[PDB]
Swiss-Prot record, chain B:
Disulfide bonds join 21-75. Glycine binds at residue 9. Heterotetramer; the NMDAR subunits are modular and harbor tiered domains that function in concert to regulate opening and closing of the cation-selective ion channel pore. Forms heterotetrameric channels composed of two GluN1/zeta subunits (GRIN1), and two identical GluN2/epsilon subunits (GRIN2A, GRIN2B, GRIN2C or GRIN2D) or GluN3 subunits (GRIN3A or GRIN3B) (in vitro). Can also form heterotetrameric channels that contain at least two GluN1 subunits and at least two different GluN2 subunits (or a combination of one GluN2 and one GluN3 subunits) (in vitro). It is found in: Cell membrane; Postsynaptic cell membrane; Synaptic cell membrane; Postsynaptic density membrane. A hydrophobic region that gives rise to the prediction of a transmembrane span does not cross the membrane, but is part of a discontinuously helical region that dips into the membrane and is probably part of the pore and of the selectivity filter. The extracellular N-terminal domain (ATD) is a site of allosteric regulation to modulate overall receptor function. The gene is Grin1. This is Glutamate receptor ionotropic, NMDA 1. The chain holds residues 724 to 819 of 938 of the full protein.
Swiss-Prot record, chain C:
Contains an N-terminal domain, a ligand-binding domain and a transmembrane domain. Agonist binding to the extracellular ligand-binding domains triggers channel gating. A hydrophobic region that gives rise to the prediction of a transmembrane span does not cross the membrane, but is part of a discontinuously helical region that dips into the membrane and is probably part of the pore and of the selectivity filter. Detected in brain cortex, olfactory bulb, hippocampus including the dentate gyrus, striatum, thalamus, superior colliculus, inferior colliculus, midbrain and cerebellum (at protein level). Detected in brain cortex, hypothalamus and cerebellum. Heterotetramer. Forms heterotetrameric channels composed of two GluN1/zeta subunits (GRIN1), and two identical GluN2/epsilon subunits (GRIN2A, GRIN2B, GRIN2C or GRIN2D) or GluN3 subunits (GRIN3A or GRIN3B) (in vitro). Can also form heterotetrameric channels that contain at least two GluN1 subunits and at least two different GluN2 subunits (or a combination of one GluN2 and one GluN3 subunits) (in vitro). In vivo, the subunit composition may depend on the expression levels of the different subunits. Found in a complex with GRIN1, GRIN3A and PPP2CB. Found in a complex with GRIN1 and GRIN3B. This is Glutamate receptor ionotropic, NMDA 2A. It is found in: Cell projection, Dendritic spine; Cell membrane; Synapse; Postsynaptic cell membrane. Component of N-methyl-D-aspartate (NMDA) receptors (NMDARs) that function as heterotetrameric, ligand-gated cation channels with high calcium permeability and voltage-dependent block by Mg(2+). NMDARs participate in synaptic plasticity for learning and memory formation by contributing to the slow phase of excitatory postsynaptic current, long-term synaptic potentiation, and learning. Belongs to the glutamate-gated ion channel (TC 1.A.10.1) family. NR2A/GRIN2A subfamily. The gene is Grin2a. It comes from Rattus norvegicus.
Length: 49, 96, 49
């Protein structure tokens, strides 16, 4: 029940913002307040051709 | 053939192209954006609607909606391979 | 990005760009942060321009 990482820094007021490859999901958006998604991501599978 | 080109959302245009044989999309998506559920600037449903949308994205509900409503295909004939000759293509030599 | 920068193009994402969770990267902020509105508007302006 303790957040670690960039979300951990934002939650515990050690950082106002967390810029980076930060994916939006339900739990994080419950614990922090995300902005508009500025790049599309999501689960994907990469295999050798 | 009254309008040469129609600029519109990727989802709607791609669905129309998949459904209709005589229509085809171009490509090179621009102004990448997303459909949102608009609400007034001071509303009580803001956070809950956003969280429900995110949760439906996390599981397969939005994938199920795409499958049932957008991701079904009637006539496509879209490939990079060279076209296969058909009756009308070489009916001239048969009549010859 | 890794597939684009891959050497020899031996690695590919299946489905020709198949994305499952289709979320997006966001700028994390503290709950009820006063910067959310300005950051959202700025990001949307950047996308529009
Ligand atoms: C929005 O969602 C929140 C969280 O689910 C709701 O708040 C809870 O509501 C239930 C039912 O009234 C209560 O039993 C909980 O104690 C509430 N928890 C919190 C965090 O207050 C809220 O009712 C929902 N509705 C809106 C639009 O605000």
């Amino acid at each position: 029940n303790v957040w670690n990482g960039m979300i951990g820094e934002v939650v515990y007021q050690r950082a106002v913002m967390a810029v980076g490859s930060l994916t939006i999901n339900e739990e994080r958006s419950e614990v922090v307040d995300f902005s508009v998604p500025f790049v599309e991501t999501g689960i994907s599978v990469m295999v050798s051709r | 053939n009254k309008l040469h080109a129609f600029i519109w959302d990727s989802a709607v245009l791609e669905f129309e192209a998949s459904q209709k044989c005589d229509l085809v999309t171009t490509g090179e998506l621009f102004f990448r954006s997303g459909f949102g559920i608009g609400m007034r600037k001071d509303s009580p449903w803001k956070q809950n609607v956003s969280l429900s949308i995110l949760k439906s994205h996390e599981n397969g509900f939005m994938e199920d909606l795409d499958k049932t409503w957008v991701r079904y295909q009637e006539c496509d004939s879209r490939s990079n391979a060279p076209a296969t000759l058909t009756f009308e293509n070489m009916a001239g030599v048969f009549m010859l | 990005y890794k597939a684009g920068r891959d050497e020899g193009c031996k690695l590919v994402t299946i489905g020709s760009g198949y994305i499952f969770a289709t979320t997006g990267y966001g700028i994390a902020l503290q709950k009820g942060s006063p910067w959310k509105r300005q950051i959202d508007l700025a990001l949307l302006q950047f996308v529009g321009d």
